[PDB]
Structure 1
């Protein structure tokens, strides 16, 4: 299943997607990706659109 991430950091902004079997797996890879790119914010997840968001 395709999941999306909306990045609204101070420095990195945009959207990316990933394929994952479920939501906890997609949250795992999105968190590592955010952390590798120095983004550190509040997170939300909406299962009706399969979209994560991180805001700094």
Structure 2
């Protein structure tokens, strides 16, 4: 399944995607991506749109 990540960081904003078997797996992929880009924030998830948001 496709999942989307919205980054609402102080110095990085935008969106990316990944393909994952479920949302728990997508969450780990996205949390690694965000950490690698220095984005530390609060994570929220909307299942209807398969979209994570990280807000710094």
Q: Structure 1-normalised TM-score?
A: 0.97
1:13-48 superposed Cα distances (whole Å, 9 cap, x missing partner): 000000000000000000000000000001101111
Structure 2, gaps ≥5 residues long:
none
The corresponding residue for 2:44 is: 44
The corresponding residue for 1:54 is: 54
CA RMSD of aligned residues (A): 0.4
Runs (4 or more) in structure 1 with deviation over 6 Å come to none
Structure 1 residue 52, shift from structure 2 partner: 0.2
Q: How many residues align?
A: 56
Q: Structure 2-normalised TM-score?
A: 0.97
**Relative to total residues, which structure has the larger helix share, 1 or 2?**
2
Q: Distance in 2 between matches of 1:24 and 1:50?
A: 11
